[PDB]
């Protein structure tokens, strides 16, 4: 059931996100149409293997003030976060550059 | 400030409203280009103009299972709502022709 006030509710929320969805599409790696219609599809399955590698990470990496650097002062956390995750090290390093850059803007 | 669980739940949130941001686009009388590239401020614009009108309607008409129902039996309703939010008495029609294509598709999802 889909009331007046449920999609009063979904404008609010998509709207909020906005300011957030512009500047991942201003990021390299996202898309340039990142999110925008037509490309809802394609920007959600990037997220979700963004997150999937999160999944990976441990609470020390996620809670740090900036997360970047905790990679670099050990390096070998690249490689379990990608081992953990399925991915390769490359993707592990590719969604923390995004991060840097997303963080710096915000 | 900004931490990697930060952007973390950000996506979760981009991964909620996704699909609803799918439906919105997917529904007439929103002009030309509703959400694509650089109209993002216009097309938001537009969301909050439709909420203002939503604004003066009331309880009984927002939880209605079918808000566009209670508006088609008590067309007077239609005439205070468009007042309220210095609408036009076609401009709240439309608000309701959208909700019922929005409405209609989300239990089609």
Redesign the interface.
């Known amino acids: 059931?889909?009331?007046?006030?449920d999609?009063?509710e979904?404008?609010?929320?998509?709207?909020?996100?906005?300011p957030?969805?512009?500047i991942l599409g201003m990021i390299p790696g996202f898309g340039?149409?990142f999110?925008?219609?037509?490309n809802?599809?394609e920007?959600?399955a990037r997220?979700?293997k963004?997150?999937t590698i999160?999944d990976s990470?441990n609470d020390q990496?996620?809670?740090?003030?900036d997360?970047a650097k905790v990679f670099s002062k050990q390096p070998g956390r690249i490689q379990r976060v990608a081992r953990g995750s399925g991915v390769s090290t490359r993707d592990v390093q590719e969604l923390l550059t995004q991060?840097t850059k997303?963080?710096q803007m915000?």
């Open positions: 059931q889909f009331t007046l006030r999609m009063y979904q404008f609010q929320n998509i709207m909020k996100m906005g957030f969805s512009q340039t149409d999110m925008s219609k037509g809802e599809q920007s959600m997220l979700k963004l997150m999160m990470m990496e996620l809670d740090s003030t997360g991060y997303f963080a915000v």
